[PDB]
Write a protein that holds these residues in place. Structure first.
Motif, PDB file in Angstrom:
ATOM      1  N   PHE C   3       0.769  -1.236   0.000  1.00  0.00           N
ATOM      2  CA  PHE C   3       0.000   0.000   0.000  1.00  0.00           C
ATOM      3  C   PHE C   3       0.807   1.296   0.000  1.00  0.00           C
ATOM      4  O   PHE C   3       1.757   1.456   0.770  1.00  0.00           O
ATOM      5  N   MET C  22      -2.043  -2.466  11.861  1.00  0.00           N
ATOM      6  CA  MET C  22      -2.485  -3.814  11.550  1.00  0.00           C
ATOM      7  C   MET C  22      -1.335  -4.579  10.886  1.00  0.00           C
ATOM      8  O   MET C  22      -1.537  -5.622  10.259  1.00  0.00           O
ATOM      9  N   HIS C  24       0.594  -3.893   8.198  1.00  0.00           N
ATOM     10  CA  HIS C  24       0.717  -3.906   6.741  1.00  0.00           C
ATOM     11  C   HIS C  24       1.851  -2.972   6.307  1.00  0.00           C
ATOM     12  O   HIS C  24       2.185  -2.022   7.013  1.00  0.00           O
ATOM     13  N   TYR C  67      -2.146  -0.889  -4.746  1.00  0.00           N
ATOM     14  CA  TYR C  67      -3.093   0.105  -4.257  1.00  0.00           C
ATOM     15  C   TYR C  67      -2.457   1.446  -3.914  1.00  0.00           C
ATOM     16  O   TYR C  67      -1.616   1.532  -3.010  1.00  0.00           O
ATOM     17  N   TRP C  95      -7.384   4.788  -5.347  1.00  0.00           N
ATOM     18  CA  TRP C  95      -8.499   5.314  -4.574  1.00  0.00           C
ATOM     19  C   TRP C  95      -8.174   6.771  -4.333  1.00  0.00           C
ATOM     20  O   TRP C  95      -7.040   7.118  -4.002  1.00  0.00           O
TER      21      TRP C  95
ATOM     22  N   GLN D 128      -8.919  -0.115   6.871  1.00  0.00           N
ATOM     23  CA  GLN D 128      -9.459  -1.420   7.214  1.00  0.00           C
ATOM     24  C   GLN D 128     -10.038  -2.044   5.975  1.00  0.00           C
ATOM     25  O   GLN D 128      -9.894  -3.241   5.759  1.00  0.00           O
ATOM     26  N   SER D 129     -10.691  -1.224   5.158  1.00  0.00           N
ATOM     27  CA  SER D 129     -11.299  -1.700   3.923  1.00  0.00           C
ATOM     28  C   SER D 129     -10.201  -2.181   2.976  1.00  0.00           C
ATOM     29  O   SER D 129     -10.397  -3.115   2.197  1.00  0.00           O
ATOM     30  N   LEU D 130      -9.035  -1.546   3.062  1.00  0.00           N
ATOM     31  CA  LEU D 130      -7.904  -1.920   2.224  1.00  0.00           C
ATOM     32  C   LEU D 130      -7.368  -3.297   2.575  1.00  0.00           C
ATOM     33  O   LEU D 130      -6.986  -4.048   1.689  1.00  0.00           O
ATOM     34  N   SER D 131      -7.335  -3.638   3.858  1.00  0.00           N
ATOM     35  CA  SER D 131      -6.857  -4.964   4.251  1.00  0.00           C
ATOM     36  C   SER D 131      -7.864  -5.994   3.736  1.00  0.00           C
ATOM     37  O   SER D 131      -7.503  -6.972   3.078  1.00  0.00           O
ATOM     38  N   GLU D 133      -9.413  -6.479   1.380  1.00  0.00           N
ATOM     39  CA  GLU D 133      -9.385  -6.781  -0.049  1.00  0.00           C
ATOM     40  C   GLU D 133      -7.985  -7.257  -0.400  1.00  0.00           C
ATOM     41  O   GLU D 133      -7.251  -6.590  -1.132  1.00  0.00           O
TER      42      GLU D 133
END
Ligand SMILES: NC(=O)C1=CN([C@@H]2O[C@H](COP(=O)(O)OP(=O)(O)OC[C@H]3O[C@@H](n4cnc5c(N)ncnc54)[C@H](O)[C@@H]3O)[C@@H](O)[C@H]2O)C=CC1
Ligand SMILES: NC(=O)C1=CN([C@@H]2O[C@H](COP(=O)(O)OP(=O)(O)OC[C@H]3O[C@@H](n4cnc5c(N)ncnc54)[C@H](O)[C@@H]3O)[C@@H](O)[C@H]2O)C=CC1
Ligand SMILES: NC(=O)C1=CN([C@@H]2O[C@H](COP(=O)(O)OP(=O)(O)OC[C@H]3O[C@@H](n4cnc5c(N)ncnc54)[C@H](O)[C@@H]3O)[C@@H](O)[C@H]2O)C=CC1
Ligand SMILES: NC(=O)C1=CN([C@@H]2O[C@H](COP(=O)(O)OP(=O)(O)OC[C@H]3O[C@@H](n4cnc5c(N)ncnc54)[C@H](O)[C@@H]3O)[C@@H](O)[C@H]2O)C=CC1
Ligand SMILES: NC(=O)C1=CN([C@@H]2O[C@H](COP(=O)(O)OP(=O)(O)OC[C@H]3O[C@@H](n4cnc5c(N)ncnc54)[C@H](O)[C@@H]3O)[C@@H](O)[C@H]2O)C=CC1
Ligand SMILES: NC(=O)C1=CN([C@@H]2O[C@H](COP(=O)(O)OP(=O)(O)OC[C@H]3O[C@@H](n4cnc5c(N)ncnc54)[C@H](O)[C@@H]3O)[C@@H](O)[C@H]2O)C=CC1
Ligand SMILES: NC(=O)C1=CN([C@@H]2O[C@H](COP(=O)(O)OP(=O)(O)OC[C@H]3O[C@@H](n4cnc5c(N)ncnc54)[C@H](O)[C@@H]3O)[C@@H](O)[C@H]2O)C=CC1
Ligand SMILES: NC(=O)C1=CN([C@@H]2O[C@H](COP(=O)(O)OP(=O)(O)OC[C@H]3O[C@@H](n4cnc5c(N)ncnc54)[C@H](O)[C@@H]3O)[C@@H](O)[C@H]2O)C=CC1
Lengths: 134, 138, 138, 134, 134, 138, 134, 138
Positions: C3, C22, C24, C67, C95, D128-131, D133
């Motif tokens: 990301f 989280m 990532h 992303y 996005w 959170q929405s990114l994880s 997916e």
């Protein structure tokens, strides 16, 4: 032979830059030093000053120019007052950017030598360009 | 031969007036009627429309024009949105007035055929007039 | 998988912070170092850059991300310009935060994969929390 | 059961519209009647008023609501003063949009029940929405 | 024969009141209706309007007056624009209050018939009064 | 015969210029030298002073004048304070410019001999000029 | 033992001057350097700074004072934000000038130790003085 | 003995409230009824009046008071004008709130018996409370 430009907005800025690109000497003036420094390189002599003050004007040595372009926009009063002072300092050619018909009217009366309406003039020039292409 | 100008401000209205004066057909378009009416006499047709509306764009049969000039003002998105729309209508030539630098680059990528910077552009023309008073033999 | 968030303001920085929390991987990017530095500890990498510059975008090897979230603020053109740029790099998912209505439609046509309206969107979630106080059995 | 929303900006506006779409009754208030009329159809009772004035508040019948959302944004003072008055009127649930950390801090002290940071909260929701997916 | 006064400040107000006291007909105009109503009784026809708008001017029936006094003060631009429009409507006698030397300069160029500097003129009149008393 | 003007603004400086032009002796006084100097050539004497200072007032030997005109501006207290001071110096005639209505009444009670309202006063004179263009045989 | 005063207006200014006259050490702070210099002589350490910025506050050595008087007036937000920061820095005694009832109300909540209403307090003090004289 | 307060703002109203609380007779007076009414319950009498009007002042039989406090606000002339008026009524004690330095000196010469500077005065009392924390044995 000499060119001075007061008002480094989109119009005056562009004018100072071309004159420089054509290898001519230009005196670029503007109140806020932001601009005065942003055109320091593109001009022969950038100066922070207020065109509405006769003293800053004489100290600027403005009566030593044959062509002075007043490119102050938004502030019609400053624009008007400036060309008025210049007319007194007796500048041979003073070209002024006008904001509308009435601003244009008084500029004539005050004695401006050439009144420019950037967006309108460009429009007629663009329409001509359109004919010239089928 | 077919000319359409969207946005009847100083720039756009000024080009509509010139095309008319030279006897060309011009479709003038704007959102408020005051503007539309004040140009009725200078255009073969003066329509009221929101160029951002793809349906309103089709009503004008805008696809029948070879040259469309987007001259919307302050609203920069309105401008790029309009030019995105008439570019999916396959209009041959779209000329747009650019508000600033980022606007210019995005218009460039959007597919605009010609980008105009009224102030800057007139700026170099005036500087050229001044220059001539020295470089040319006068 | 990977990301990248461009524009570390309230919205962007807040998504960088959560992805980090989280566990990532996240590439945070912004024009001023104050922002970039203040997020160094919440991202695998925090780079200073002007997303409008296609060369700067390549330096970040931004094309290696699936992303990319464009969260530039006030400067609407900056946003759509950035979006346009990374859409030419074939980025799979882009996005973007939309400032208003015309921006949304433009972004939509530019090819944005998902458009976010922070205020309005949070607005319906709040309204949903409230509604639950009546509709849900409590 | 009763919902009132003060400050029809992007946030508040959106909140009045969903509640309406979910078929709930809402009292939408705002100072400039531009907004108050733009949401007249999307609300059960739109009213022009100034949340910072106790009288306009009581005349508004504000104490008859269980949930009052203060969606005033830019004006931190108005926002703060408003939840302060509401707390005195003794509203059971007052949720307020906060502009920053400090605005948030005093809102707690004043007694706000839920403090919302629309952009930040959405940011975490989006991550959170990114994880979710891959 | 007819007198119109635009700008009900200390100067114009005084002028409208005397003309009325001398039993003459006066058309008193001013933008904010506060003034327009405060001079309703002391004038033959008080009107709320903006002298800088040609339409409000013609609808005012201003070309039916032989003497129009522009008494707008602070706003030099409005003052200037107003006398300019009047000159176009072709008013026979337009007297204008000037704020300073330059405002005075352009007023001349625009075509004003009499330029008044209230405080300066009164000063020379007061000095004369002083001689006239030993 | 003895004339003194305090406050060299539009009003005061204008009376000093007139008295000079008619060959009268005038003592011009002000707080800033720029004003004082710009009137040196129009007055038998141009002194720098703060009229509110009773000691500075004595230095000027202001008591030797029969007519003193207070023409201070914006600072209404400065004006009434000055006129209170030179009234305890027994000055025969004190003429003061009045800022407004309450100022006029207080000056009246303070003992001012003549009160001037520049704008209003010139206002009726102009109205008289206009009136004459109708009432007089012209 | 240590006294700091933020906001050199009539109230704060007066407070810095007495403390100095009583021969005590005071830290006088204010944003515009006009004031900061006007009280340089009447204070033990005048400083130009913005109380609403934590950094200028810590760089000011604010946490080394036992009594900090926030004398900011007009700007209720600045005033409130300032005592809020000070409360975090953990100042033992923070006395604040309040502009009205509500400003006062939130100051309590924020944790202000003493809230002063200069004009009102003086009013009661004056009435008491009135009794004390027959 | 008897007390009259003119100007029911923060200062004036606050002195009316305290005199009341200590059971003293007080005549509160102000120009707008909202103020006058809101103090009706804290004074033996609350009258609506413009203290600058000498006739209105006589209607109140203001001359029957030994102590009159002028607490008019912003309008400095209103204050000195009122002070001047009730000094012509031979009022034994007139206490006035002073807006600034020139106002103080004027009031002083007008014949005011006591001049109050709310902000500055409360200012030294506060400074005294603070000083006591060091000088007094605690
Ligand atoms: N200023 C702004 O932020 C914006 C202006 N516009 C529009 O742009 C048009 C004008 O374009 P520009 O000329 O680029 O804008 P402009 O009014 O800012 O440019 C005039 C230039 O004159 C200089 N200037 C002004 N008073 C001066 C004085 N007394 N002495 C010396 N220099 C002085 C200013 O520093 C400025 O660079 C207007 O129609 C305006 O409505 C549109 C958007 C934003
Ligand atoms: N007119 C104004 O109030 C202001 C103008 N300026 C600047 O002054 C310069 C010159 O002004 P203009 O461009 O002539 O003014 P402008 O921005 O009003 O001109 C654009 C024209 O396009 C029309 N238009 C706008 N959105 C449209 C839509 N969706 N569909 C169809 N027509 C639409 C407008 O009614 C207008 O006649 C510009 O650079 C502008 O940014 C800056 C501030 C205010
Ligand atoms: N921060 C401010 O001064 C103001 C913010 N607002 C509004 O407040 C809301 C929330 O504020 P934010 O969006 O968080 O503020 P913001 O607009 O500053 O956030 C955007 C972030 O992107 C960065 N950025 C901008 N151009 C960039 C580029 N070309 N390349 C890389 N990074 C770039 C900025 O430095 C910033 O950290 C927004 O809706 C905004 O429009 C409105 C007025 C002023
Ligand atoms: N206001 C603007 O033009 C812009 C605001 N922004 C950003 O948007 C964010 C806030 O978004 P919005 O809520 O849409 O903006 P907003 O501040 O305009 O909306 C608040 C709403 O509260 C209402 N309101 C304010 N005081 C009130 C009172 N005393 N009583 C009743 N109603 C009252 C206003 O009429 C308005 O509709 C901020 O972070 C700001 O920086 C970004 C660009 C422009
Ligand atoms: N305006 C104020 O609050 C103050 C003004 N002054 C000074 O007073 C002098 C001027 O005195 P006044 O003439 O009494 O002040 P003024 O400028 O308010 O009076 C001019 C009158 O013209 C009217 N006016 C303005 N634009 C107009 C328009 N477009 N159409 C019709 N009416 C229009 C105004 O409503 C006003 O009553 C200035 O030198 C100023 O600096 C001193 C203190 C306060
Ligand atoms: N000059 C300005 O900046 C402004 C003037 N006005 C209004 O414009 C009108 C005409 O302006 P003027 O009265 O000529 O301007 P002014 O108020 O500056 O004239 C008074 C003259 O008295 C001098 N003066 C002031 N206090 C003094 C003292 N204690 N001792 C000695 N001399 C002292 C001043 O330096 C000044 O030259 C007035 O009705 C004024 O209220 C309104 C706003 C600003
Ligand atoms: N400011 C004015 O021109 C006038 C104020 N008043 C009244 O006076 C009362 C207040 O009196 P003052 O305290 O003398 O006025 P004030 O509000 O100007 O004084 C407050 C002081 O706080 C300082 N300050 C403000 N924000 C600051 C910050 N962030 N950091 C550091 N210093 C900061 C200011 O520089 C100022 O010296 C109010 O009730 C007001 O309505 C009456 C007439 C004029
Ligand atoms: N209230 C306001 O809007 C403002 C107040 N300030 C400052 O705030 C501070 C505290 O405010 P206050 O003095 O309480 O406000 P204030 O100036 O309104 O208080 C004076 C009181 O006297 C009354 N009054 C005025 N003229 C009168 C007359 N001729 N006869 C009888 N009563 C008359 C007023 O209605 C008011 O109740 C002051 O230093 C003031 O200068 C500064 C700006 C605005």
């Amino acid at each position: 032979k000499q060119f001075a430009v007061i008002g480094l907005g989109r119009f005056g800025g562009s004018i100072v830059k071309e004159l420089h690109r054509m290898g001519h000497e230009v005196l670029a003036v503007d109140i806020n030093e932001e601009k005065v420094n942003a055109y320091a390189s593109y001009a022969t002599h950038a100066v922070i000053a207020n065109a509405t003050e006769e003293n800053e004007l004489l100290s600027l040595g403005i009566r030593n120019f044959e062509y002075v372009i007043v490119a102050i926009g938004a502030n019609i009063q400053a624009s008007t007052l400036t060309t008025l002072l210049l007319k007194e300092l007796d500048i041979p050619n003073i070209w002024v950017k006008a904001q509308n018909y009435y601003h244009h009217k008084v500029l004539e009366k005050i004695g401006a030598d050439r009144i420019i309406h950037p967006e309108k003039d460009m429009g007629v020039k663009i329409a001509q360009s359109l004919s010239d292409e089928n």
